[PDB]
Symmetry: C4
């Protein structure tokens, strides 16, 4: 084996991230303005815009979930707060009309009670929200939710970064599989634990397990540019979950911060010391202030529309069949 | 598949840019001073110097087109201005002697009228000027022009970045095919849409479709150094179109700008907010002031001549047969 | 041969370092808090924590060896000092309870006398401490020690970076093989001599020779993050030796240094001019002050535990079977 | 073809530079102090130290040639000066004892007269000094010199970067072949002409043509560290020619320059505007002042000796059989 040892499987794959690839232009009769950006969030729920906001306490509370739903996407309410409060945020979103909303739950002691309170509040999507879904506790939670409230509520499981892990969630009954172990902008898992999976390869592998069962993949983490949304969907994801790209917006939690004449907002990992309050796997940082969500989403969707025009993709299902070119460091 | 999924065609190629390769020296009896730099712009038009200036409003108006023609190349007049004015710039270039000149047209409502006004003004080359020529509207425009005014006017189509797209333009009747989707110095398509094609690979692929039909390829975008001109031609292009490298010159539109003691000129993408006035795919920037065009062209051609000496290429047609070595990031 | 010449063996391998790989998550029922971090230092000695401190005069004297043993690892006392003093440091560590301790010896004139004085002082591990163990003098020293004091003392040999070199140490009787030629943070061997071996590949190759004989591999040098510890063990090492990561701690030799408002400690290679006092193969540098050792070890072990959770490794022997993904420069 | 087009030979090789490889340690009974560093400069001339100074007007005049010879290497006197003066510098070196000395000649009108004046002055080595030796004029000059003065004078030809070019020089009668097109620290040929060949691959290819005919290869350009000398020799070169590494020394031409409190000397390409006085292929720069040559050579040879110890190379001929590991950008 060229890289050492005698086991060809020790280094299992070459992992590509978004920056490693570009979408190739293809024959197109699709104008960007006329592309259909709708896509499956879950087996039953289709969004007008294939974007959901991260379940983080510096990204999604009720204000963000309302704005996301109104822009045609969805918010996933974070779970770093009392059950009663999270449930009350779900109610607040429902007070603002017939708006879709999701909410995160863990697999800890209080997770089941949280899930039931969220169901009672009228939540549409429960997101079983872990760093590692390839685990019997997580698979059991997904399965139990699906068997208990699955007729009325769609159940997302995550996160995973391999084909086997995605397959396990599918078998447990997940209505969507969320992909991303280690790629987040505020993530330090790669350096703390040495664990991760570059996101284009992780998506390609998860989709290989999920698409044949009609289960949509949510690409979660590592998206830095609107072009990354198109790349993630072309790799086969059906939606993208965004943290950093939405944390700078007016609708995200937190105050404006002024440093050296420029405006920022705080953005922190849910595994940072601050969020957990220990061996943290995220940092506390800041992102540039970006203005209203509606405006940010317009630009992100605009980039996606451009990609759909270049690739001749009339729908997201067509974009999922687009081809890449791999690029070098020089590119 | 080592990079993920089970489809070997999902990642279709490894795309190389100029910085990824060097020309290998070869047996040579060619002195740089004696190399013949002439090359086909189109099937019928041969230039003394294989360089044309970009159809951009911070690169080519009448002054630049005149200087380019006099230096042995050609200018392509930009189309971000009224039809009457563009036509009047064509006339101005013709007032300055028997000088070749080209002009850009789109495929919009006013494009046909623009094309006819340019023909009436005496234009030599019409450049159907789009970001994505692999499209029925663009192919139809090329074909219609070629069938209508093709006896007197050469018709260039672009831009493309794949073999299939180049083949389509050839079949539509293009007299030259322009290659470059995403490589421009002021381009943000790669980050906004996630779309692009590294230029050495794009040229190699376009040439595979164009050379067998005797259709010249114009390498457009991404050329940063005189050495890149030689690389582009060696990959099989017949001419290079330059934006950034010519925008700093006296003959380009725009005033001198002084910042921190150094001289610059503005250089902006035609897809920047400023040029379009929205989801822009270019930036507004600045380039160092470079002095007279004649001097810049002398240096660029000097570098090309050096390459022809090292590779033993007496003509551009010989240079098109030269070989590369691929280099690493360290190189 | 694509890279030149006609000999496929001239460039023998593609060498990967820690930064080139990530651990892939796998099915897991292992909680990080419940993982067993114990591992073989040598054939007979098992540590609670798979970490030993470098035999360097800015990393390990008696204070560090005591703290390392108490944290569940071990210190290797440096040998840049008189025999009587090194022996006295061994005694000092033994005065502090039933604590494991190692000590370095060379292969020079005084090395045997040093080894015997260390044995008399009660040392548990002798580390034959060289930059290049693939040498008859080094192999002879290992063998002689093992045949003379091997019933009571475990004998480590190093350093190596190839399968053949590791095999030679195994045959000489080593109780552990230490791997690392050129990877240290303060090392300049790569630039001075042009010699080295990227550490993931070096570990994979050494383990291929050592594991079949039940000889543990100590990964020595180049570990910059807690995640690198997990990577090294997953590549098949049984323990990691740390210099830079422990040199910033309270228990390391040397005073606090204040530069530009921040706190540092000096950290220097044993092949630096200063340490040898000439063609040095190390630098004299500084590392950020890190606080108490106990705290640093907690964080390092915390990262390892996280990796064990993600990979489903209940023990270090299980972690040694984990798989990698290779990543690109972009990642 | 993965990188584009249908011709597998268009991109002929993957070119490695020094930074792309490391020497692998091997079984060794060689102490660095006892290695034999002697090596063939030409078929007949063996140096004690395998180093020659570049024929550049900021590196080698009589003072440098004397110091190089005394250190066991050789200087090549530059030719950017009148014939009478260059000849007088050769005489000056001969006045200082039985010291070896070389001198550069071109292939221009005055080159033959220069060569004869140098022969009359007692030169030992004539270096036919060009940027591209794969040329009938250069091959003819080499052949004519060898047939005319070859009994008393060794004739070096260069530069080349391919197997074919090296083969041509061998057939012309060269006593050594100098390798390096584009790698020099002050070289801009790579960006001006787009031409070059990474030096490890260039050496491997040249050696494939030269070693079977018993013709030594001189590695010229791109050596930045003492470790690069060992790499070049291991790739099969017999000596290394140094510009940048020797330009900072007391014995090089030029005055000390003080900028921002630090000491430098000027170092310029022979293809820079300044040296030629136009399309330059070198820059005018500065290098840190390094002190006496004797000291610099001691450190360079010290690094080489270290490499010989690590690789078990008792002689340079043994070092030429050493193996590499290829490293990644991360390494
Ligand atoms: C505190 C939580 C959440 N984060 S996080 O906030 O940083 C985080 C949140 C969401 C997605 C993430 C995607 N990649 C990295 C971290 C992500 C990391 C640590 N953590 C775990 O649950 N770790 C863990 C890991 C493996 C296990 C296990 C527990 O028990 C069985 O096997
Ligand atoms: C405003 C124009 C021109 N630019 S530009 O100014 O930035 C630009 C100009 C010239 C060459 C370019 C080479 N690469 C990138 C951009 C380039 C980009 C956006 N644009 C389009 O026409 N986009 C578009 C794309 C695909 C389509 C489609 C329209 O309809 C069918 O399929
Ligand atoms: C002074 C000592 C120790 N260092 S060090 O302090 O920089 C050093 C110490 C420990 C581990 C190291 C891992 N890689 C690099 C250097 C390391 C380097 C120089 N050195 C040698 O012994 N060199 C040497 C090399 C090869 C030989 C040989 C001697 O005789 C036969 O073959
Ligand atoms: C002025 C001289 C010397 N230099 S230099 O000073 O920059 C230079 C000097 C020495 C080694 C060099 C190694 N690589 C690059 C440049 C090097 C470059 C330009 N030059 C040439 O002779 N160029 C040339 C090239 C190819 C030809 C040809 C002439 O006629 C036939 O084919
Ligand atoms: O602390 C953390 N460490 C690692 N990943 C996190 C953490 N907090 C949230 N995440 C994940 O990172 C995603 C956001 O990534 P981003 O959009 O690149 O910033 C989130 O949706 C989570 O999946
Ligand atoms: O706004 C833009 N975005 C992307 N490409 C552009 C834009 N404007 C012009 N171009 C193309 O970029 C080329 C100039 O590239 P440059 O020489 O690298 O600066 C032009 O000839 C166009 O093909
Ligand atoms: O001067 C030196 N040059 C090269 N390697 C050294 C030197 N001194 C110590 N080492 C080795 O570098 C290891 C420390 O590496 P680090 O943890 O990356 O700083 C040590 O355990 C030694 O194996
Ligand atoms: O102007 C120049 N351009 C390119 N190569 C040069 C020039 N002048 C000298 N050289 C070559 O560069 C070598 C020095 O390279 P260096 O040791 O990397 O600085 C010289 O021995 C020449 O072969």
């Amino acid at each position: 084996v060229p890289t050492g040892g005698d086991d060809p499987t020790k280094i299992a794959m070459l992992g590509l991230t978004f920056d490693d690839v570009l979408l190739l232009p293809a024959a197109s009769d699709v104008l960007p303005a006329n592309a259909d950006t709708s896509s499956q969030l879950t087996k039953k729920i289709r969004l007008k815009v294939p974007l959901v906001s991260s379940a983080m306490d510096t990204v999604t509370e009720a204000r963000m979930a309302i704005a996301m739903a109104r822009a045609g996407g969805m918010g996933v309410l974070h779970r770093n707060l009392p059950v009663a409060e999270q449930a009350a945020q779900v109610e607040t979103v429902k007070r603002s009309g017939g708006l879709l909303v999701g909410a995160a739950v863990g697999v800890g002691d209080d997770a089941w009670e949280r899930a039931m309170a969220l169901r009672d509040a009228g939540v549409d999507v429960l997101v079983v929200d872990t760093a590692h879904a390839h685990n019997r506790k997580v698979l059991d939670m997904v399965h139990r939710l699906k068997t208990t409230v699955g007729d009325e509520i769609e159940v997302v499981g995550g996160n995973v970064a391999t084909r086997a892990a995605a397959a396990a969630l599918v078998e447990a009954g997940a209505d969507a599989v969320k992909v991303g172990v280690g790629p987040g902008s505020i993530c330090t898992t790669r350096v703390v634990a040495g664990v991760g999976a570059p996101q284009i390869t992780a998506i390609l592998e998860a989709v290989a397990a999920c698409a044949p069962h009609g289960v949509p993949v949510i690409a979660d983490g590592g998206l830095q540019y609107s072009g990354d949304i198109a790349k993630a969907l072309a790799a086969g994801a059906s939606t993208a979950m965004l943290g950093s790209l939405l944390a700078g917006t007016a609708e995200s939690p937190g105050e404006l911060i002024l440093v050296n004449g420029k405006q920022f907002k705080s953005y922190r990992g849910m595994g940072s010391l601050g969020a957990m309050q220990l061996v943290p796997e995220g940092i506390e940082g800041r992102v540039p202030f970006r203005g209203p969500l509606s405006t940010v989403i317009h630009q992100l969707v605009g980039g996606l529309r451009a990609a759909m025009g270049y690739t001749g993709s009339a729908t997201i299902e067509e974009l999922q069949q687009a081809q890449f070119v791999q690029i070098t460091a020089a590119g």
